[PDB]
Symmetry: C2
């Protein structure tokens, strides 16, 4: 990829600054030009790509530096001497390797690359291997403990005993009750192939990787330790040495991963206090060896959560230097923007949002950009970027690079890691190819195949063409400012897929409802998953797919609480907040990216809010759209009084004729033949458009379909779907 | 109604232990009790029929018939307390969440000396909130009504009799004021000497959840009730508003969540006792989502859920007892009851002595599963089934027609909540020999106790002696009880288990034993229990899976033992890790046939397939007409299946009504192993070695044993099990 980058924040109000971090692998400088994004879908059959150039607001030419992406998580203990004494060196850990077929993976290492001095303890399908530096003029010593290690808890160690003139490398299975527990060891004579380190031999101590930066560990490490003497003799042929076996003197370090589970620090419990720092956001708050099932929450039982899960594809915070900054002038109207980057014919877009001042709005409407959901889907490598799609990207002039070809940009929370575990973290401090104008997600046979940021621009482009002024706020803005940020507006509008939320963003929308506002839920499958977040780890979102529902992977028992903020993760249902309580409808069906039509329930025209159907002939409508060819499609929401729909809900229309591939949302089911309402599951395959009054003075309008806004621009913005939204926004504006 | 029925305090006894039997007879004549050994309990004419061995020479007796009642409905009783009130008046109130106001008058708090017409009662209904005051020997009671339309939300309710102001007040306020239209109503009446201070002889029990002049059982949650005998833009009076002096009592339901005691926090120490086992460890008004475990956050679980149909411990007096003589061999027994042409059976088990086996095989009676299903009113007892029950001479009473015996953990309560508790201290009509569960077009329609007798009758007929232990025995004794036997055999549906019973079976494998998993859908749900409440099981259907109801967020931990409830999957123990296969499909009560994997005959343990022609077999049976049916288990390496598993056969041709088990699904198009869901509709018979010296044999089908007796015990399924048990016995 020639040029790409990211910003430290995704939204800034008047007087706030966005720092942009660009990586350019050209030898010539690049250009940055501010644009306002109007339509980001490059499908020729629709409005096409549309920007408003604002180079006169911000323009610049800047020097190109090529900055790298290094996936793989690990911990660095810095500013420590080389380990060892004249008596020797001992190091070890409790480990659970989750992908040994991937090669040499380092448990712990300390290596001065220049002086060829240090140690490294590694595992692979060959067993447990010790590498010792031998100086500038000898190849390294290697001692191998051949064992067939599986995905279980093992104790691994090496010991250099000068007095006995022996090296030992061993591995013992922690659970001795299994039928054939592994216990192997290798004994070599030392023969002055090792001598106590010297002051200049110093280097950082790493856990999970090796620096001469490679051999990233996949799986769990628990309680690593280093000692520079042999264990105090106490009274099974051999056992693994652990930190408890050493005098406090002899301990060089002993890390307890149970301390600080919601932080990036690994704590050393010896008086040396040789702490370390985790890099690339490994997964904490996972079961360790003492976990037995009686404890399920790391906040009250940290000794059962005394391990950290490392993955060789973890990616958080690229650490790129800031190429330029932009401070929002008090005259730039709130909207959706980007920095068009350009060099050698290659272009990127760095999207960001200009947020209104709290309490003084610039329009009657505000749109909520679903940045938590964008970030959770960020860089989803869907394995679908085949020749036919790659061809369409060219023909249409769409954003040229896809996560399937670019694993250097890391994964989404819809992916699995290399060892097969679910990706629980997603960073926004990296290039997010899936949030670029022009990016296509699906080879859509009946439309563009655009999602999230790009598909949300259908609505922003429609809002503009119909003369509706709007301000834009993000999920982070709601997290920061609360309902008070929304209160000034006559209606709040969602995107096409507001799926991921915190208690703060849900509370912002409910408080806005309670203040008397109007809510336009213009998507499907909203308010379904919880995200975790921390002030202590900015730029990361956490997702733990607990219990059930439609999920790309399943969290393990006991690991349901977030590490970032300690909250119970998973379905919002699972924390007593169903979508129906916010917007009257809830996720009920999911199928492929294909849409269908609505049918008017004409009984509605006479009820409160049935005038919203005026100028829609019917009885069908909406059988068109840039998102899968229909206004009701992909993921659908319907009414459930039991799941919280208000008794005054007015169903205006109800979809039909979805393909046989549409099935029921699992979390709505007690069995494969009965819903939670004890109806049959086929009653779930439908999208329902509803209207109701909140009882606080405002109303709610819900479409329950991700593809709904994809139909707005059909027939040059003149169609039934366009007419319906116009009726809503006119009504919501008195 | 039911002429004679009953139950026992325990279901198994070893040598020298005693079983106490409690009988209710509506006859004016005495009844007879006679000991029998149950051999076959299925009354289907097309199969071996009912079969007993009478042992009246071991125990017989004639006993007076007493009619003993069944009174459903949970509540708390505070006894040994004076009548509440002073010359200044009386105030009482509580925080409530009514879950079924259309069911009639439902009492929050009451105290009523019925003879002297003295006391109080605070009730709710669809009409509002009502105070009833006693009025004396020759007057009807006072009634003051605060008309309000109450919903299923948290309200504060109270009444106050203030003699100084000559006022009665009855009021209700919605706890959450942030709602659109918060309810705030009250009614004011003049007192006019329609009440004064109580007298010593007015004393009576104070009840929470019911009224005794015993009626008006409350449906929903009660939290922090209190009584005061003094007074502290109206607001609800709460216990915090009163002098220490002015408080008669103030109960905090958060204290003792795993007990039946309700604790009074005032120095009066006027504690109370819960009856019929209402549901504890439920969200209270302060629950906010940050805590999900009552053991570390009791203030979020400071409420109790009452149901007018809770049934635990009938309290019937023992009519007779039986002490097991050293000469009665371990087996499945019953007490045949008889009076006026009516017959009941009181089943129980004789357990071998620890360490002294009497046979090479032991059978595990799935009593935790029987109890979880006990008195399951399925709504299926129509004219056709009642007729079939007549023709076959089957047990004549069904839970559907006889609701005084309470519910199963598969039913919903009257207020719509899931039934979390099942008592064994009540008549269990579904554990009687002769009980039919389903109108089966292709067999008997038999489950659990009765279906397990297919296996017990086959073992006898094939000459295999066996001992019997129950789940409760494994809970008490552990793997040590199983160790002496050459093989442990399960029943048709060993579904419900504790950590102690799962450990007894795993420990037995590690000791070198052989395990015959002869059912389907085993080891699936967790059960809770405690020695503090003997005779009760708790089931909380958390997270997912195939479930009759869904537990609420934050209520996933048992009240009885504090453990995380639900699927054993959700406690990190899948069925596959124990027996190599795990629940994967369920359909109607229908069976189909297996197909031999002929690659198996040459592998380890393919000699078990000897004398089975194939490639199909088992297309017959007393349970749904096929040896693979109803609920099926198949292999999953990801869920823990050993790598040396050998698939001997695989079912096929199940009806379109058979679907996948929900907890095996990531979406409607992908399993946890990322295969398509149709790969789940199959039962797989497996054999493998444990590595400790023994082996495991698993059929993964509930209906398997329904085919053992086919064609006078000479058939492929009979041949298969015979081969296994012979092999397991050297």
């Amino acid at each position: 990829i020639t040029i790409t980058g990211y910003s430290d924040v995704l939204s800034a109000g008047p007087g706030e600054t966005v720092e942009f971090k660009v990586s350019s692998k050209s030898p010539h400088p690049f250009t940055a030009e501010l644009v306002r994004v109007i339509h980001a879908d490059p499908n020729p059959a629709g409005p096409g790509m549309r920007f408003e150039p604002l180079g006169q607001v911000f323009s610049g030419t800047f020097a190109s530096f090529d900055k790298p992406l290094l996936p793989g998580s690990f911990a660095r203990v810095s500013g420590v001497p080389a380990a060892g004494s004249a008596a020797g060196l001992v190091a070890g850990a409790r480990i659970r390797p989750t992908a040994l077929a991937r090669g040499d993976q380092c448990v712990m290492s300390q290596w001065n690359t220049a002086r060829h001095a240090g140690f490294a303890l590694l595992v692979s399908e060959r067993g447990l291997e010790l590498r010792l530096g031998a100086g500038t003029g000898e190849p390294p010593v290697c001692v191998l403990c051949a064992a067939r290690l599986e995905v279980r808890w093992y104790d691994v160690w090496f010991a250099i005993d000068t007095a006995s003139n022996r090296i030992e490398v061993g591995v013992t299975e922690v659970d001795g009750s299994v039928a054939a527990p592994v216990r192997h060891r290798t004994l070599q004579m030392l023969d002055a192939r090792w001598r106590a380190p010297h002051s200049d031999d110093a280097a950082d101590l790493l856990i999970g990787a090796l620096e001469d930066r490679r051999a990233h560990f996949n799986g769990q490490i628990e309680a690593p330790f280093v000692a520079d003497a042999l264990p105090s003799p106490a009274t099974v042929e051999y056992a693994a040495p652990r930190a408890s076996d050493f005098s406090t003197d002899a301990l060089y370090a002993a890390w307890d991963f149970a301390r600080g589970i919601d932080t990036l620090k690994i704590a050393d419990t010896t008086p040396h206090a040789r702490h370390g720092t985790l890099q690339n956001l490994p997964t904490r708050a996972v079961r360790s060896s003492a976990w037995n099932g009686r404890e399920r929450c790391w906040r009250t039982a940290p000794a059962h959560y005394a391990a950290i899960h490392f993955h060789d594809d973890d990616l958080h915070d690229a650490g790129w230097s800031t190429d330029f900054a932009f401070t929002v002038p008090a005259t730039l109207k709130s909207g959706a923007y980007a920095m068009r980057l350009s060099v050698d014919g290659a272009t990127d877009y760095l999207p960001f949002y200009v947020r209104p001042e709290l309490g003084r709005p610039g329009a009657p409407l505000v749109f909520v950009a679903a940045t938590y959901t964008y970030q959770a889907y960020a860089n989803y490598a869907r394995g679908n970027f085949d020749a036919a799609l790659r061809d369409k990207v060219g023909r249409w002039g769409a954003y040229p690079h896809n996560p399937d070809d670019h694993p250097e940009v890391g994964l989404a929370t819809y992916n699995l890691h290399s060892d097969g575990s679910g990706v629980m973290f997603s960073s926004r401090l990296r290039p997010m190819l899936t949030m670029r104008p022009g990016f296509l997600t699906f080879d859509d046979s009946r439309g563009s195949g655009c999602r999230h940021y790009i598909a949300d621009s259908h609505l922003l482009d429609w809002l503009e063409h119909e003369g509706f002024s709007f301000d834009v706020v993000t999920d982070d803005d709601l997290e920061r400012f609360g309902a008070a940020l929304l209160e000034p507006y006559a209606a709040v509008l969602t995107g096409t897929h507001p799926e991921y939320h915190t208690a703060a963003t849900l509370d912002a929308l409910a408080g806005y409802k309670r203040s008397g506002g109007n809510l336009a839920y213009l998507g499907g499958n909203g308010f379904y998953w919880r995200v975790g977040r921390s002030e202590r780890v900015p730029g990361a979102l956490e997702v733990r797919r607990t219990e059930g529902g439609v999920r790309a992977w399943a969290a393990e028992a006991g690991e349901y609480f977030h590490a970032l903020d300690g909250e119970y993760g998973g379905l919002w249902r699972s924390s007593a907040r169903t979508p129906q309580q916010l917007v009257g409808v809830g996720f009920s069906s999911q199928g492929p990216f294909e849409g269908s039509h609505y049918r008017v329930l004409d009984a509605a025209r006479s009820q409160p809010g049935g005038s919203l159907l005026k100028d829609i002939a019917g009885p069908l409508f909406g059988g068109y759209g840039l998102s899968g060819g229909g206004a009701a499609g992909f993921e659908l929401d319907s009414t459930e009084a039991a799941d919280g729909t208000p008794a005054n809900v007015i169903i205006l229309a109800r979809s039909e004729s979805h393909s046989a591939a549409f099935g029921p949302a699992l979390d709505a089911l007690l069995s494969h033949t009965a819903t939670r309402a004890r109806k049959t599951p086929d009653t779930l395959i439908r999208s329902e458009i509803v209207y109701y009054e909140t009882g606080y003075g405002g109303a709610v309008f819900s479409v329950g379909s991700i593809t709904f806004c994809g139909a707005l621009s059909h027939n040059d913005y003149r169609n039934d779907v366009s007419t319906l939204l116009r009726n809503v926004l006119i009504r919501f504006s008195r």
